[PDB]
Design an enzyme around this catalytic site. Sequence first.
Site, mmCIF file in Angstrom:
data_model
loop_
_atom_site.group_PDB
_atom_site.id
_atom_site.type_symbol
_atom_site.label_atom_id
_atom_site.label_comp_id
_atom_site.label_asym_id
_atom_site.label_seq_id
_atom_site.Cartn_x
_atom_site.Cartn_y
_atom_site.Cartn_z
ATOM 1 N N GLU B 142 21.362 56.980 36.548
ATOM 2 C CA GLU B 142 22.719 57.383 36.876
ATOM 3 C C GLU B 142 23.186 58.517 35.957
ATOM 4 O OE1 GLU B 142 24.932 53.670 36.948
ATOM 5 O OE2 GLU B 142 23.100 52.649 37.654
ATOM 6 N N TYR B 212 31.590 51.618 44.681
ATOM 7 C CA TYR B 212 32.590 50.848 43.969
ATOM 8 C C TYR B 212 32.692 51.478 42.593
ATOM 9 C CZ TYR B 212 28.233 48.345 42.844
ATOM 10 O OH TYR B 212 26.944 48.064 42.489
HETATM 11 O O1 LIG Z 1 24.048 50.437 36.730
HETATM 12 C C1 LIG Z 1 24.669 49.487 37.220
HETATM 13 N N1 LIG Z 1 26.037 49.319 36.958
HETATM 14 C C2 LIG Z 1 26.769 48.219 37.616
HETATM 15 C C3 LIG Z 1 28.269 48.535 37.595
HETATM 16 C C4 LIG Z 1 28.809 48.319 36.185
HETATM 17 C C5 LIG Z 1 28.728 49.354 35.221
HETATM 18 C C6 LIG Z 1 29.208 49.128 33.916
HETATM 19 C C7 LIG Z 1 29.767 47.876 33.574
HETATM 20 O O2 LIG Z 1 30.217 47.654 32.305
HETATM 21 C C8 LIG Z 1 29.849 46.850 34.539
HETATM 22 C C9 LIG Z 1 29.371 47.069 35.843
HETATM 23 C C10 LIG Z 1 26.267 48.073 39.044
HETATM 24 O O3 LIG Z 1 27.031 47.797 39.951
HETATM 25 N N2 LIG Z 1 24.898 48.213 39.294
HETATM 26 C C11 LIG Z 1 24.186 48.349 40.583
HETATM 27 C C12 LIG Z 1 23.076 49.333 40.225
HETATM 28 C C13 LIG Z 1 22.705 49.005 38.778
HETATM 29 C C14 LIG Z 1 23.993 48.472 38.145
#
Ligand SMILES: O=C1N[C@@H](Cc2ccc(O)cc2)C(=O)N2CCC[C@@H]12
EC number: 3.2.1.14
Lengths: 497, 496
Positions: B142, B212
């Site tokens: 990312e 999201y």
């Molecule tokens: O990289 C991601 N991040 C999380 C989102 C997230 C990011 C930071 C945080 O403190 C809490 C939640 C997610 O939905 N993911 C789906 C893909 C991998 C994973």
Amino acid sequence: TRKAVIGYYFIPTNQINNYTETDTSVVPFPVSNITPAKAKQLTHINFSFLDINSNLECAWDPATNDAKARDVVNRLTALKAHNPSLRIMFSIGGWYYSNDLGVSHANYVNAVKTPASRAKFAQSCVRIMKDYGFDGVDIDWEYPQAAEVDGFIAALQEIRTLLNQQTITDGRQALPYQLTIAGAGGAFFLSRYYSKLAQIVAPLDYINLMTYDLAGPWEKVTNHQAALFGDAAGPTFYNALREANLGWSWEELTRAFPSPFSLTVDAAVQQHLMMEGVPSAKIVMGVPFYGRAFKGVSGGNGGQYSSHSTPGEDPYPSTDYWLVGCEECVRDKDPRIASYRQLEQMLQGNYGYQRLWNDKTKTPYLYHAQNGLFVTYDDAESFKYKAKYIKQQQLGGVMFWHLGQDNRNGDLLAALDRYFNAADYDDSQLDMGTGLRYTGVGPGNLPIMTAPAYVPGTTYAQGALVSYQGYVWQTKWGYITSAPGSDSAWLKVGRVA
Amino acid sequence: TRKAVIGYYFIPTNQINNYTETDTSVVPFPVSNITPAKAKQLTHINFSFLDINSNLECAWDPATNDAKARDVVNRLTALKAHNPSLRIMFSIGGWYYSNDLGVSHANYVNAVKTPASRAKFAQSCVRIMKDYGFDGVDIDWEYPQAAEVDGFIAALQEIRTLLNQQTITDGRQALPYQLTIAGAGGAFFLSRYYSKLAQIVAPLDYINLMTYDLAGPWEKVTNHQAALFGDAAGPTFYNALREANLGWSWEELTRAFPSPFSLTVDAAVQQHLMMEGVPSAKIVMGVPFYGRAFKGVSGGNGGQYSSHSTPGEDPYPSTDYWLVGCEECVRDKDPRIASYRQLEQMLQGNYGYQRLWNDKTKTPYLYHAQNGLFVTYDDAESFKYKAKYIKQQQLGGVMFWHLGQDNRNGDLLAALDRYFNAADYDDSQLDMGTGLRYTGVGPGNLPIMTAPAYVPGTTYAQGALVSYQGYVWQTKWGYITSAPGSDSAWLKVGRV
Ligand SMILES: O=C1N[C@@H](Cc2ccc(O)cc2)C(=O)N2CCC[C@@H]12
Ligand SMILES: O=C1N[C@@H](Cc2ccc(O)cc2)C(=O)N2CCC[C@@H]12
Ligand SMILES: O=C1N[C@@H](Cc2ccc(O)cc2)C(=O)N2CCC[C@@H]12
Ligand SMILES: O=C1N[C@@H](Cc2ccc(O)cc2)C(=O)N2CCC[C@@H]12
Ligand SMILES: O=C1N[C@@H](Cc2ccc(O)cc2)C(=O)N2CCC[C@@H]12
Ligand SMILES: O=C1N[C@@H](Cc2ccc(O)cc2)C(=O)N2CCC[C@@H]12
Ligand SMILES: O=C1N[C@@H](Cc2ccc(O)cc2)C(=O)N2CCC[C@@H]12
């Protein structure tokens, strides 16, 4: 450096074939009307037109009496005795031969396709130049587009190579052979090759912009054909350059190409200057020695910006020569175009014309209240502003079509020469007016700017300015963790000194 | 085609190292919590996270006890006994490892740099996949930036080649090894590689959009983090895609990227669909099984679109856990994120929260009037609209982060499965609402049109329409004497 004053000398094949200097009914404007004084006021005469034939070589119209053609060219080259700086160029193409629907268009497109065709074509240009005694080559292809541009560029480079060698071979170091082209002066045609302007202009001594014909009966609203600056009350146009294959971002396109915009001489010149590598000194501002006329115009604003009932078809579809008192219009069977010479006579003869002036566009126009006629043209007054613009913008000079349209006294040409060279002419206080200036900025012509060096690892907020790899960049949104240029969040907004 | 239901199974290294299925205090969500029922409702479990080390190979966190890691993975793959279609993928990366300022960022950039580094990296992914028994590779970088995109693409192609070979070698025609990535679900990060989306998606079975986190304390105005459609009353954002290196004309960029625009799930999906070569079937809509909370919000619109005083720093820079009733927040030392499990319990604990519904965005939100708290999250109701959208737009399915955040009964997952597969669920009349739809149009989603064939030699007036080379084109000005595609005067406006 002396400003170029490039005047076209246009002579139809039938006139060359029946050339005479004592019958204006046969040859309206013989070379003998180009007096020593006029010769001295010119730096170049573009003899027109030669063409590119089906053999893909520069050639005279096949119907030309070669001996008569030589004699006409000789008369022009003899003029060099009056001005050691004068060049008699010859122009290949022009609107009728080379526009997309012109009879010879295919030949321009095909001539520039391959190394072989380009070599053959370039060689023919130089051969013609030497054989007839011309001092340079001018190509007026209106206009190459798409995949034709790279070939066109290469053909120009080839001719350049051949001309430079020819200068050496002939010991012409004192007046080297030159290469020029007539370039579009309006965004629509300009967009065809705009992205490659730098490559196109590199091998040229000058690119003569056709910064006129920006209005005409083919447009629904009457307007000045060569407004220097814009009139907000006048029509505006789609800025076609924003659709050219530039590869710039939305912000860059938007910054460079406000749209709609005022189709003016200033817009064309500034549009060329927004491109990196296009030196102002090579840009020559074209001006018309003729006016364009409309009928069916409303009153109120002297015929400006009005609907009209003028056929835009070419050739003129009717026998109705409605431009009151325009005798040459009868001769050329078209009441929509009239030489400055003719307009001046119309103004002098109780024909119902009123000469008006638009102080925003800095151009004159005639309004015939009685018959609802409007004529947009240029004169010695509009030329003062255009000449000052040429000097202020450090352009290479002026080009005009065509010598036979100046009045008998040669006032327009004398005016241009005066504004550039007369010790007793001073335009230091000439007010350029409040007409609209073209304000686009091209990533290629960014202002010098100063900003803190970009710091890797830094998260930048929106609007942040940093200097990096030669430019000042601005973020377009926040939380920027990328280096300028590495993504899409940064916009080059300035050059680092 | 059954819709994919991709659920992340996230387990930090210390939990792997202390793995237990009988003590929530150690491992809140052990694999045994994924019951046969849940296993059947999932099509993929993305085990997370592995990383790319300095040796530029896919690898576990160096602190991982390999024996326990193998055991946790084995428990997951044993779930396939309950579902023959279930794949246990492993995800490489994630926000913390791979974001620009993340600990392992350089390894991602460096691993995709050369044919040799890509080959080595690709090999390591397959080796890890086979050694631990995973069913596919998921990469969550990312995100690669413009200059790293070609390398990233080449790496994905290399992994695709190796996986396809491995599938044949292992007789896995019935359940081919897969390759997926977590893709940006917001225009800003998306703009990094947007121009090469077709190339990026070509080697993938799915691109799982993180549709999201489109709102958070990092933004000055609270907003829904996963609005399906837009709310004109909500903030709007700069459409970063218009600055992507697409090479498009001003008209093309403009019609594709209205700006500002509503940062929504629909926007992200349509933005992907606007690119030619990006099939809807590979697009997977991500949904969060957690909500994001803000404090210091004003009343008036239930906390929506309000200024707030929530810290944006990561990790949470204080010990003030102001999300009332959020025990998991204490456990995780951050009151700005709460699992759906926790939010549900917060709602039924009389902690002063009201559950409100925005019918434009089709998402719920919590408002705590007494303390000025706002929480944007998703639930089984918002999933109805999202599931219907997934069906209507012919997307590949849904992805969510993460399994441990669903409530104990696994209601969120059961809901998604129900909406896609239940014979007794009928969303034919589900009102998708009047929220703002993303209206951009690009090369990949041109409307079907008809027009007279273009005729060389003809001069076209402004606005004229013609068909040429399978598309319908319109002139942008008049006296057009050139052909569509050879003249910048033509705008491709329709297909066929
Ligand atoms: O990289 C991601 N991040 C999380 C989102 C997230 C990011 C930071 C945080 O403190 C809490 C939640 C997610 O939905 N993911 C789906 C893909 C991998 C994973
Ligand atoms: O046909 C025309 N020819 C132009 C002159 C011209 C010739 C060649 C060229 O490439 C461009 C312009 C004219 O004065 N016209 C007067 C009326 C008819 C009209
Ligand atoms: O192509 C051209 N066209 C003319 C303009 C023109 C065009 C058509 C017409 O009927 C009358 C005048 C000119 O200014 N030129 C200067 C460059 C060559 C020459
Ligand atoms: O200015 C130029 N001069 C020539 C170079 C030159 C100089 C002196 C000489 O005797 C002969 C040729 C050229 O290459 N150009 C390329 C474009 C401008 C044009
Ligand atoms: O905390 C966030 N901050 C926002 C914005 C951001 C991005 C990069 C950065 O270095 C700092 C802030 C985000 O995109 N997010 C993605 C997941 C975490 C969440
Ligand atoms: O640091 C966190 N990590 C995330 C989980 C995570 C892990 C890796 C990854 O790439 C993305 C998300 C979380 O739930 N959080 C709860 C509060 C702290 C915060
Ligand atoms: O008559 C014109 N017509 C306009 C517009 C035009 C262009 C191409 C075309 O095939 C027909 C009309 C023009 O550009 N012009 C250039 C010189 C003549 C003048």
